[PDB]
Amino acid sequence: SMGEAPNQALLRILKETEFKKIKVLGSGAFGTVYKGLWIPEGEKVKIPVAIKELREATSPKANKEILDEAYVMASVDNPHVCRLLGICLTSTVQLIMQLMPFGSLLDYVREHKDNIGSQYLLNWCVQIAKGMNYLEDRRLVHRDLAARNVLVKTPQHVKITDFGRAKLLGAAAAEYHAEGGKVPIKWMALESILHRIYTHQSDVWSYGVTVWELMTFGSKPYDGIPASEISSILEKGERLPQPPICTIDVYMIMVKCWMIDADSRPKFRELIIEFSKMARDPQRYLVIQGDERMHLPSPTDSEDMDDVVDADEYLIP
Ligand SMILES: COC1CCN(c2nccc(Nc3cc4n(C(C)C)c(C)cn4n3)n2)CC1
Ligand SMILES: [Cl-]
Ligand SMILES: [Cl-]
Ligand SMILES: [Cl-]
Ligand SMILES: [Cl-]
């Protein structure tokens, strides 16, 4: 027998005493994300982390789901994908992840709109396409790509997250079912809404919507339309409108991601190519008032911090 290659990823189990929670970054019914610092055993290193604790969500189903997330996050290794650093098996389990201090890309474009230039937008499109192409190479279909699920390490460096709907293409044929729900309808390809089919090319659709969110500075897709209508809207041939800043060049690429025929949508590798050409001449592809004059940061705050290392530079041997 041989059908798929062995996943030789390492799951690191960390002690409670190696790390400290400093502030809360957010909470839902999934638990609590804390901003923290991880200091590995014997290493003269301080790594800023996000610690996602289940928060006493002692459902055995929720424990299974968050360990499924942990499985995928421990298995990925790419500059544009969030990796898991380790787990801690306290009473409520804790996932230890990299701190992405500027938050989600969605909230970033909403907050910083008047200071984001075309170079940033087009580079973010390249980076998400690189991270999605990596997931495709690993045979992973993400199933929840959206600007909320892209995080910002620096304004110059984004990564995809949220692996709690992700499925391996090659996982028992059952790609006609509501794995993790069937709920992000406004980002979903039509075949996923109607049939529960999911593919790399259905993530291309969601990529198109994600780009549309970036180019509209965080506007809600199909705002005011209930999710019940979306399928019929798409079957009748309507799509999201051309964002004001977008040339027909950029918008036609979005439109191509929303073709009914999945195989006529672009591949992630081609989206990398196309957005990279556009990123060499940004003002030709997005028209933004003030573009010539924009300035986003690169460093951070941080309080004695001499041995701080970012997780991307702390490579496990
Ligand atoms: C929904 O449950 C989790 C939210 C956080 N998520 C995740 N993955 C990898 C790294 C990572 N790092 C991070 C997340 C955040 N936030 C928000 C967005 C909470 C702020 C303000 C700073 N950081 N740093 N987060 C995974 C899913
Ligand atoms: Cl980079
Ligand atoms: Cl709009
Ligand atoms: Cl225009
Ligand atoms: Cl193309």
Domain boundaries, the chain: 16-98, 105-291
Q: Pseudo-torsion of CA 294, 300, 301, 307, nearest 10°?
A: -160
**Which amino acid belongs to residue 259?**
M
Give the C-alpha separation, 79 to 135, whole Å.
Answer: 12
Superfamily of domain 105-291: Transferase(Phosphotransferase) domain 1 (1.10.510.10)
Ligand 1 pocket mutation pick from 23, 24, 25 by most atoms within 8 angstroms of CB: 25
Does ligand 1 have an atom closer than 6 angstroms to the CB of 79? Answer: no
- Bridge partners, 46 (sequence order): 308
Active site residue 144: yes
The CATH number of the domain covering residues in 16-98: 3.30.200.20
Q: Quick one: which ligand is closest to 111's CA?
A: 1
Could you identify the residue written with the tokens 């556009």? 278
- Write 20-23 long-range contacts (CB < 8 A, 24+): 21/51
Which residue minimizes the CA distance to atom 17 of ligand 1?
A: 103
**What sign for the dihedral angle of Cα 187, 192, 198, 204?**
negative
DSSP 109-159: HHHHGGG--HHHHHHHHHHHHHHHHHHHHTTEE-S---GGGEEEEETTEEE
Catalytic hit among 137, 144, 203, 223: 144
Put the strands of the sheet holding 84-88 in their side by side order. 19-28, 31-38, 47-53, 94-98, 84-88
Which residue minimizes the CA distance to atom 20 of ligand 1?
A: 103
DSSP the chain: --SS--------B--GGGEEEEEEEEEETTEEEEEEEE--TT---BEEEEEEE--S---HHHHHHHHHHHHHHHH---TTB--EEEEE-SSS-EEEEE--TT-BHHHHHHHHGGG--HHHHHHHHHHHHHHHHHHHHTTEE-S---GGGEEEEETTEEEE---TT-EESSSSS--SS-TT-S--GGGS-HHHHHH----HHHHHHHHHHHHHHHHTTSPPTTTT--HHHHHHHHHTT--PPPPTTB-HHHHHHHHHTT-SSGGGSPPHHHHHHHHHHHHTSGGGTB--TTGGG------------TTB--TTT----
Does ligand 1 have an atom closer than 6 angstroms to the CB of 85? Answer: no
Distance (Å) of CA 79 to CA 92, 135, 199, 216: 29, 12, 23, 26
Q: Quick one: which ligand is closest to 217's CA?
A: 3
Question: Distance, CA 251 to ligand 5 centroid (Å)?
Answer: 11
Q: Quick one: which ligand is closest to 84's CA?
A: 1
